Design a protein around this nucleic acid. Structure first.
Ligand SMILES: [K+]
Ligand SMILES: [K+]
Ligand SMILES: [K+]
Ligand SMILES: [K+]
Ligand SMILES: [K+]
Ligand SMILES: [K+]
Ligand SMILES: [K+]
Ligand SMILES: [K+]
Ligand SMILES: [K+]
Ligand SMILES: [Mg+2]
Ligand SMILES: [Mg+2]
Ligand SMILES: [Mg+2]
Ligand SMILES: [Mg+2]
Ligand SMILES: [Mg+2]
Ligand SMILES: [Mg+2]
Ligand SMILES: [Mg+2]
Ligand SMILES: [Mg+2]
Ligand SMILES: [Mg+2]
Ligand SMILES: [Mg+2]
Ligand SMILES: [Mg+2]
Ligand SMILES: [Mg+2]
Ligand SMILES: [Mg+2]
Ligand SMILES: [Mg+2]
Ligand SMILES: [Mg+2]
Ligand SMILES: [Mg+2]
Ligand SMILES: [Mg+2]
Ligand SMILES: [Mg+2]
Ligand SMILES: [Mg+2]
Ligand SMILES: [Mg+2]
Ligand SMILES: [Mg+2]
Ligand SMILES: [Mg+2]
Ligand SMILES: [Mg+2]
Ligand SMILES: [Mg+2]
Ligand SMILES: [Mg+2]
Ligand SMILES: [Mg+2]
Ligand SMILES: [Mg+2]
Ligand SMILES: [Mg+2]
Ligand SMILES: [Mg+2]
Ligand SMILES: [Mg+2]
Ligand SMILES: [Mg+2]
Ligand SMILES: [Mg+2]
Ligand SMILES: [Mg+2]
Ligand SMILES: [Mg+2]
Ligand SMILES: [Mg+2]
Ligand SMILES: [Mg+2]
Ligand SMILES: [Mg+2]
Ligand SMILES: [Mg+2]
Ligand SMILES: [Mg+2]
Ligand SMILES: [Mg+2]
Ligand SMILES: [Mg+2]
Ligand SMILES: [Mg+2]
Ligand SMILES: [Mg+2]
Ligand SMILES: [Mg+2]
Ligand SMILES: [Mg+2]
Ligand SMILES: [Mg+2]
Ligand SMILES: [Mg+2]
Ligand SMILES: [Mg+2]
Ligand SMILES: [Mg+2]
Ligand SMILES: [Mg+2]
Ligand SMILES: [Mg+2]
Ligand SMILES: [Mg+2]
Ligand SMILES: [Mg+2]
Lengths: 118, 100, 221, 152, 145, 50, 110
RNA sequence: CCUUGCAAGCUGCUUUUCCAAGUGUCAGUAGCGGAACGUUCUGUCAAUCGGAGAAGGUUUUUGGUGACAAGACCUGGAGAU
RNA sequence: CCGUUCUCGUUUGUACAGACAGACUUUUGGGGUGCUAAGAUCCAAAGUCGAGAGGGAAACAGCCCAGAUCGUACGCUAAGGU
RNA sequence: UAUUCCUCAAUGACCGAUAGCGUACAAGUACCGUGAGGGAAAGGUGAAAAGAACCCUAUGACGGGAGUGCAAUAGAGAACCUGAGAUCCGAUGCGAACAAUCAGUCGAAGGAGUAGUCAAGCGCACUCACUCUAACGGCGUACCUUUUGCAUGAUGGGUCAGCGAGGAAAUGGGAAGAGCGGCUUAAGCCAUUAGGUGUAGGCGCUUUCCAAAGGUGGAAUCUUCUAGUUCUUCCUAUUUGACC
C-alpha cells in the first residue's frame, strides 16, 4: 500500500480439476481462500479453470504489472505463503536496491559548501 | 587497547568462584592446551565459563593463563555493574546555535 | 458400513445377464476380507510386467562392427592422437560401449505372496461394491448387441472384466472380441494386473468356488 | 482412496534407493576418479582379491593335516526331550514301537535322513514311561535313562 | 500479545493501529529532522522520507507506528542531543510493504582441487513511510506574501 | 618465529622492534600479570562445599 | 549451471567471452568470485569513507577524529559513524554543536 | 542439523510429527553417507490438452538453497503426457 | 583416589574405503653426517601448509594474528599500525 | 538332439538419418593399393506442380513487381518443412587518438530512449520509475591435470554443433523392506487377452570335540525359554574384455 492506496488489485487463481499437480492449490481453496477473501475486502479474487495445465497465482497491480507464481506440486501452506507475498508487495520490479533511505531534501540547514561561515 | 575493559576496578582477594574468559585464538596452539580449554568448557573466542575455586581448576588456569582472563566474583560484578551504569540514561542537552 | 480386514464372511446377491434375482451367496472371509496393503500389490504388478517384458534389444561390440583390425597409422611421428582401430567407442560409426544385449528381465517371487496379492485385489473389488456375481454366463446368441445393450444398461462403469470358471463358452468368446471395454478370462488366468485394469469385476459361481478352493488348498511341498 | 487400488497410487514401504552412478559431475561426490584415488593398480582395476604382496601367504605357510574318509556314516541326532514333548502333544503313540519311520513322519527327523538315527540324552528328565525304541545308535545316558524307566 | 508488545519495544517501534481512509497523514515537507534507531541501523529522516529496515515481525500493512528510540533532534535553529535517547521526542511512521529483494549468488570455488558450490539468497525487508516529527519547535505555517 | 634472514632465496624479512610492537607486548604482560595475581590471591585454600 | 544461465550472466563481456561456452564459463566464475569477495570489501570501504568525512568535518574546528569520537563515547552519545558523516556533510551547525560537546567532554592531551 | 522442554498420535507407551528456546554446531582434497532436479521409453491412457494453435527456436518476466520450473509476445504448423 | 567436561569423541561386531612420493619453521641452544655450508640429508618434540580462505610481513604455500552457513552503507577488538 | 545358405506368419518398455546392417538414396559402388586387401558420403517443397504467363533493370534473372497457393524465404534441379551456434557484412544510441595489464567486480558524474498513477483544480510530483552506455575511484597474476609446492617460462585445448567412458549374467559377503512359521523350488508339464502346477534338490532343526575311529546332561527353578528360510532394492568380491 503506497501512501494508503492498496496496490494489488486482482488475484487470479488458475487451476485444474483433473491433474495431479493441482492438489495443493485445490485444497487451498477450501481451507485458506475464504479467510483471505474475508480479511481482504479491497482485493478482487478471480477463479479460473484450465484443464490439462499447471496451476498458478497471478497478481495484477495498479501500475500495470503482472506477477505469476507457478504453484505446481505444492502444499496449501506454501500456496498461502506465496499469496501473502503477492498481497504484501507494491508490484515494483525485482532489481537490486540501490539505496535504503530515499529522500528528496538531503539537508535542512543546507549542504556544506566552501563558502560556509560559522 | 582491549584489556582496558578487563582491568580490575576492585582489589583482588580470595573468592569462592572464578569467571574465565577466552581472549586468544585456537589455531597455532598445542593440542594439549586446546584439550585443556575444551575440558574447561571453552570452545569459541570471547566466551565465559563459571567455576568454583579449587586447585583442580587452578591448575588448568595456570596451564593456560596466557590465553584467558580470570576474574573473581567481585571483579566480575564490578565490571558488569560499571558497564550498565555507563550505559544508563542521562538528561539530554539542548544547544541553540542560530545566526548563520 | 463395515471395516475391511477382519476376515469376515460377506453375503452377495446373485443375478445374470437378464437382471433377474437368483439368490445369495456367502463369500469366504479369508479370500474376500483380507487387509488392504498397497506394497504387496505394487510388488505383484512389478513381477507381472517384468515377466511380460520381451527384452530383444541388441547393439554391436567391436568384435561385431564391420572394420579392419589394422592400426590406422604409426604409433609415433604423425602428430595425431594414437588409435588402435577406427571403430572405437568414441568414433563415429564405432561400437557401443556398455550397450544392451538381448536378455530376460524376469524376476522371482513367492507363490504365497502372489496368492496374498490376488486375495487383496479381490477383497478391494468386493469392498468397493464393484463385484457382481452371476448365476451363469450363458447367452442366447453370439451377436455383440447383447453385450453392448447389457453394458449400456450397467451403471457407473468404464471397463468390465468377466471371469468364467472353466473354459470360455464359444458364444461368449465371439460376442466380446470386438469390444475393447469388456474383456473375458478363465478362472485359471485370474491375476492382479487384469483385475486392476478394469474397475468392475463380474464373476460366476464356478469362478468364485474354484478361486476359493484354490486358496484353501495349501501348496504341496 | 476408500479401499481404492489404482495404478496411480501404488508405492512401497520405503522409497527406492537408486544406483550410485559414478563419474558424473563435481556435486554428486563421486565423479573424476569415482572412488578409486590416484593411479596405482587398484585404480586401473587389475588387482586380484586375496593377494598378499609377494610375501609367502598364510595359506601356504601352514601344514596340511589328515585324510578324508569316503565311507563316513552320518546319523541324525534326536534327543529324549523332543520325543517326550511330542508324546505329551499326542502326536507319537507311546504304547507302540518308536521306529525311525515314526520320527520321520512326526518331524523330529529333518528332511534328509542319511544313514540312520542316533538317540541322544538331552532332556532326559522328561521321560516317565516305558518306551520301546528302534534306532541306529544310542548313547550311554539315553539307554540308561530309558531302561531305568523300564523301556528298551 | 504483551510479549509481542514488549519485544517490539525492545526493537524500537510501537503499533498504534490501522490507518482509516478518513485520515490525512501525509502533510507536506517541514524543515526538521530526527535520527531513529531500529535494531542496529540508524537513519536520519525527515517527514515524507522512506526507509528500508529489516523484517519487523509484529506489524502489517497500513499500520501506524511510533518510533520510540530517537537519538537526535534538529532544526534550523537548535539541536537536542539525546544521551542516549530522547523520551519526549516522537516520530510517526506508516508500514508500507514487506518484500524480498533480488537474489544474490553465493559462489565458492577452489582451483585445481575439484570443488565448487553455488547457492542463492533472498533477504526480506520492510518499508516505512515517515509522516511526522514531534519534540522540537517547528516553524509556523508560513504563508509569506 | 622465523630467524633465518641471511641465507636461501626465500626472503623472510626481519620484523622490526618498533614502539607499537613494544606497546602491544606490555599489554600482553599486564594481562598475564593480572592472571598471576588472581591465581596467587585465590590459591591460599580450596573453596569448601563440593 | 545451465548454458543459457551463463550466457545471461556473460551479457556485456568484451570479446569472445560472451559467445563461446568454454570462454564464457571461465570469466563468469571469476565474476561471481569477485562479487562474493566485494560483498565483504564494500563494508570496509564504506566505513573508511565515513571516517574520512567525519575527520574532515571535525578538523575544521580543530578537533581530531580520535578525540572527537571518544568524547562522544564518554558523553554516552551513541550516534554511529554513518549518521555522523551524514551530519557533517548536510547539517554543519549540528555537527559543530557535537564537536563542541565532545571537546568539553574529552579534550585529550596537546 | 542437533539438544532440551511442551502438545499430539503411537503400540513402541515409546517413535514420529507441530511449536518454542538454545553465548549448541555448520572450511575442506582422497574418501564415506543422506536427500533431490532433468533426459528417452513404458503402465495409469480408446483418458486429458491441441486452428480458442502441439513439439521445437528467439526475446522477456516471475519462483525455489540448486540442478531447474513456469507466465506472456514473436516465429512455427500437428503433435504432447 | 578425587574434581572439570554432558560431549561417546572409549571398547567392540558387520559393511565401504583412501593413503604407504611429504614441505617448511622453531639460535648449530635436542642431535648424527657435511665445512658448526646449503631452500642438502637422516632421526626426536611442537606448529602451519598439505586439505585453509581473511588481516600484517611491499610482492609471499610453510612466519605473526585468527578458523569462511547466508544478508546489512551497524558496533568492539587481535597481529600490525596512526 | 545341433545349425540356418532358405520360405511363410507374428512380436518388440529395439534404433530413428553422426542412430540402426558397411549400404533408408542404383554400395561392397565411388575411391586407395601391383596384389591379397581396405572402403565411404549423400533422407524430407507443397494436399495437388497448380514449379512463377507478363512488365522493368542487367550479357544473362536466381532480383523488384504481377499471378498460383493456407502460406513464396514454402521458389528446387540428387534439392526448397522447422531453421540453433561458431563465422561474415550493415543500421540506431552511448563510450572511444595524454593513457597500460585474466578485460571483471563494488561504487559512480554525465549522455541517450521511453512509460504509468491520481488529487486538485486538467499540474506535478510520485513510482529508490524502467532500459542502454560508463568518464573516474578501490580491489583483482585464467581453467584442467600432476604435484611437497604452478600466474607459472610444466601438460592439454583454434571456436561451435552433434557423439563419447562404473555396465550384464551367474555365484559369494552384508544392509534396509516384506512373505511364511520350518522355508523355498530347478528342469519340466497344462494353458496363454494370463497364470497354475512340478519334492528331485538346497538351508535349518542338529549335537558343538576329533586326522580318523570313537564320543556327546542347553538354560531355568516355579503357569518355562529353547531355529530360521525365500524373495526385492542397494554397496562390494570371484569368473568372464570388466570404467574407457
Ligand atoms: K588385421
Ligand atoms: K556409415
Ligand atoms: K559411438
Ligand atoms: K654470500
Ligand atoms: K512456411
Ligand atoms: K574499474
Ligand atoms: K615441456
Ligand atoms: K546376494
Ligand atoms: K524374516
Ligand atoms: Mg576384429
Ligand atoms: Mg593385427
Ligand atoms: Mg585397446
Ligand atoms: Mg554402428
Ligand atoms: Mg570428495
Ligand atoms: Mg573434471
Ligand atoms: Mg572406493
Ligand atoms: Mg590407490
Ligand atoms: Mg588421473
Ligand atoms: Mg603416487
Ligand atoms: Mg628468491
Ligand atoms: Mg617472504
Ligand atoms: Mg619513542
Ligand atoms: Mg594494540
Ligand atoms: Mg562441511
Ligand atoms: Mg512455444
Ligand atoms: Mg515423459
Ligand atoms: Mg612404498
Ligand atoms: Mg616412504
Ligand atoms: Mg619425514
Ligand atoms: Mg630446533
Ligand atoms: Mg635442527
Ligand atoms: Mg638447513
Ligand atoms: Mg629438505
Ligand atoms: Mg609432525
Ligand atoms: Mg588443516
Ligand atoms: Mg592463509
Ligand atoms: Mg594472507
Ligand atoms: Mg597484501
Ligand atoms: Mg566455521
Ligand atoms: Mg575502536
Ligand atoms: Mg548410417
Ligand atoms: Mg535431423
Ligand atoms: Mg547429415
Ligand atoms: Mg585397380
Ligand atoms: Mg523463374
Ligand atoms: Mg507440413
Ligand atoms: Mg549469430
Ligand atoms: Mg555506432
Ligand atoms: Mg580522452
Ligand atoms: Mg595497451
Ligand atoms: Mg554495479
Ligand atoms: Mg544513470
Ligand atoms: Mg533522462
Ligand atoms: Mg592493479
Ligand atoms: Mg616436481
Ligand atoms: Mg597431494
Ligand atoms: Mg601462487
Ligand atoms: Mg602453460
Ligand atoms: Mg605466457
Ligand atoms: Mg605429462
Ligand atoms: Mg597446445
Ligand atoms: Mg562441445
Amino acid at each position: 500500500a503506497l501512501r494508503g492506496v492498496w496496490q494489488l488489485q486482482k488475484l487470479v487463481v488458475s487451476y485444474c480439476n483433473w491433474g495431479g499437480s493441482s492438489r495443493g492449490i485445490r485444497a487451498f481453496m477450501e481451507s485458506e481462500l475464504p479467510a483471505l477473501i474475508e480479511k481482504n475486502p479491497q482485493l478482487e479474487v478471480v477463479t479460473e479453470l484450465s484443464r490439462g495445465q499447471h496451476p498458478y497465482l497471478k497478481g495484477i497491480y495498479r501500475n500495470r504489472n503482472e506477477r505469476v507464481v507457478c504453484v505446481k506440486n505444492m502444499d496449501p501452506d506454501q500456496v498461502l505463503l506465496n499469496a501473502t507475498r503477492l498481497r504484501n508487495s507494491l508490484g515494483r520490479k525485482v532489481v537490486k536496491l540501490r539505496t535504503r533511505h530515499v529522500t528528496k531534501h538531503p539537508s535542512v540547514q543546507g549542504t556544506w559548501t566552501t563558502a560556509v561561515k560559522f | 587497547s582491549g584489556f582496558r575493559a578487563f582491568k580490575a576496578q576492585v582489589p583482588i582477594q580470595w573468592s569462592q568462584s572464578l569467571y574465565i574468559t577466552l581472549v586468544r585464538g585456537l589455531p597455532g596452539t598445542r593440542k594439549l592446551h586446546r584439550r585443556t580449554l575444551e575440558a574447561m568448557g571453552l570452545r569459541r573466542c570471547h566466551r565465559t565459563v563459571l567455576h568454583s575455586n579449587t586447585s583442580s581448576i587452578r591448575g588448568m588456569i595456570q596451564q593456560v593463563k596466557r590465553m584467558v582472563v580470570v576474574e573473581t566474583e567481585e571483579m566480575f560484578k564490578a565490571r558488569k555493574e560499571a558497564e550498565a551504569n555507563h550505559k544508563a540514561l542521562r538528561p539530554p542537552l539542548v544547544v541553540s546555535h542560530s545566526i548563520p | 458400513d463395515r471395516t475391511i480386514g477382519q476376515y469376515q464372511d460377506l453375503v452377495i446377491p446373485v443375478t445374470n445377464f437378464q437382471n433377474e434375482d437368483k439368490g445369495f451367496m456367502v463369500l469366504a472371509g479369508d479370500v474376500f476380507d483380507v487387509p488392504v496393503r498397497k506394497d504387496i500389490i505394487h510388488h505383484v504388478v512389478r513381477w507381472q510386467l517384468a515377466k511380460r517384458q520381451q527384452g530383444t534389444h541388441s547393439t554391436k561390440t567391436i568384435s561385431e562392427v564391420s572394420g579392419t583390425g589394422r592400426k590406422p597409422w604409426n604409433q609415433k611421428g604423425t602428430g595425431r592422437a594414437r588409435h588402435g582401430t577406427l571403430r572405437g567407442p568414441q568414433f563415429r560409426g564405432g561400437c557401443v560401449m556398455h550397450g544392451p544385449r538381448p536378455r530376460s528381465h524376469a524376476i522371482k517371487m513367492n507363490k504365497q505372496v502372489r496368492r496374498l496379492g490376488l486375495k487383496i485385489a479381490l477383497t478391494a473389488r468386493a469392498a468397493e461394491g464393484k463385484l457382481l456375481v452371476f448365476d451363469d454366463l450363458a447367452l442366447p446368441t453370439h451377436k455383440t448387441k447383447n453385450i453392448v445393450n447389457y453394458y449400456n444398461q450397467m451403471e457407473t462403469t468404464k471397463k468390465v472384466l468377466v471371469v468364467e470358471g472353466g473354459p470360455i463358452d464359444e458364444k461368449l468368446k465371439l460376442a466380446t472380441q470386438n469390444l475393447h471395454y469388456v474383456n473375458i478370462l478363465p478362472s485359471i488366468g485370474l491375476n492382479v494386473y487384469s483385475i486392476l485394469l478394469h474397475d468392475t469385476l463380474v464373476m460366476s459361481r464356478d469362478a468364485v468356488n474354484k478361486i476359493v478352493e484354490r486358496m484353501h488348498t495349501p501348496i504341496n511341498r | 482412496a476408500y479401499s481404492l487400488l489404482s495404478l496411480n497410487d501404488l508405492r512401497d514401504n520405503v522409497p527406492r534407493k537408486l544406483k550410485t552412478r559414478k563419474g558424473r559431475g563435481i556435486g554428486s561426490g563421486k565423479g573424476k576418479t569415482a572412488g578409486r584415488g590416484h593411479k596405482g593398480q587398484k585404480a586401473r582395476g587389475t588387482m586380484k582379491f586375496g593377494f598378499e604382496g609377494g610375501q609367502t601367504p598364510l595359506r601356504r605357510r601352514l601344514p596340511k593335516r589328515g585324510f578324508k574318509n569316503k565311507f563316513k556314516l552320518h546319523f541324525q541326532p534326536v534327543g529324549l526331550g523332543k520325543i517326550a514333548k511330542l508324546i505329551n502333544a499326542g502326536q507319537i503313540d507311546s504304547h507302540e514301537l518308536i521306529t525311525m519311520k515314526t520320527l520321520k513322519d512326526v518331524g523330529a527327523i529333518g528332511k534328509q535322513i542319511e544313514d540312520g538315527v542316533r538317540l541322544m540324552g538331552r532332556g532326559a528328565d522328561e521321560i516317565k514311561w516305558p518306551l520301546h525304541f528302534e534306532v541306529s545308535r544310542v548313547t550311554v545316558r539315553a539307554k540308561e535313562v530309558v531302561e531305568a524307566a523300564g523301556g528298551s | 500479545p504483551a510479549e509481542k508488545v514488549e519485544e517490539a519495544e525492545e526493537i524500537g517501534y510501537k503499533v498504534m493501529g490501522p490507518l482509516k481512509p478518513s485520515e490525512r497523514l501525509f502533510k507536506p515537507y517541514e524543515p526538521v529532522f530526527a535520527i531513529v534507531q531500529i535494531g542496529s541501523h540508524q537513519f536520519k529522516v525527515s517527514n515524507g522520507d522512506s526507509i528500508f529496515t529489516e523484517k519487523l515481525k509484529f506489524c502489517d500493512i497500513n499500520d501506524k507506528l511510533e518510533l520510540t528510540k530517537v537519538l537526535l533532534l534538529g532544526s534550523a535553529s537548535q539541536t537536542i542531543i539525546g544521551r542516549p535517547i530522547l523520551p519526549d521526542a516522537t516520530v510517526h511512521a506508516v508500514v508500507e510493504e514487506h518484500a524480498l529483494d533480488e537474489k544474490v549468488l553465493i559462489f565458492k570455488k577452489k582451483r585445481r582441487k575439484n570443488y565448487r558450490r553455488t547457492r542463492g539468497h533472498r533477504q526480506e525487508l520492510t518499508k516505512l513511510r515517515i509522516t511526522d516529527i514531534q519534540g522540537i519547535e517547528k516553524p509556523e505555517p508560513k504563508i509569506v506574501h | 618465529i622465523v630467524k633465518k634472514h641471511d641465507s636461501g632465496g626465500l626472503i623472510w624479512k626481519r620484523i622490526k622492534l618498533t614502539s607499537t610492537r613494544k606497546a602491544n607486548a606490555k599489554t600482553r604482560l599486564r594481562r598475564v600479570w593480572q592472571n598471576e595475581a588472581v591465581l596467587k590471591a585465590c590459591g591460599t585454600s580450596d573453596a569448601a562445599v563440593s | 549451471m545451465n548454458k543459457k544461465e551463463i550466457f545471461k550472466l556473460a551479457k556485456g563481456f568484451r570479446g569472445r567471452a560472451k559467445n563461446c561456452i568454454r570462454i564464457a564459463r571461465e570469466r563468469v566464475e571469476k565474476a561471481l568470485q569477485y562479487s562474493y569477495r566485494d560483498r565483504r570489501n564494500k563494508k570496509r570501504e564504506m566505513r573508511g569513507l565515513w571516517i574520512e568525512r567525519i575527520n574532515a568535518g571535525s578538523r575544521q574546528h580543530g578537533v581530531n577524529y580520535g578525540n572527537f569520537i571518544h568524547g562522544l563515547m564518554k558523553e554516552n552519545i551513541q550516534l554511529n559513524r554513518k549518521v555522523l558523516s551524514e551530519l557533517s556533510m548536510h547539517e554543519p551547525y549540528s555537527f559543530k554543536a557535537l564537536v563542541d560537546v565532545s571537546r568539553n567532554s574529552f579534550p585529550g592531551n596537546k
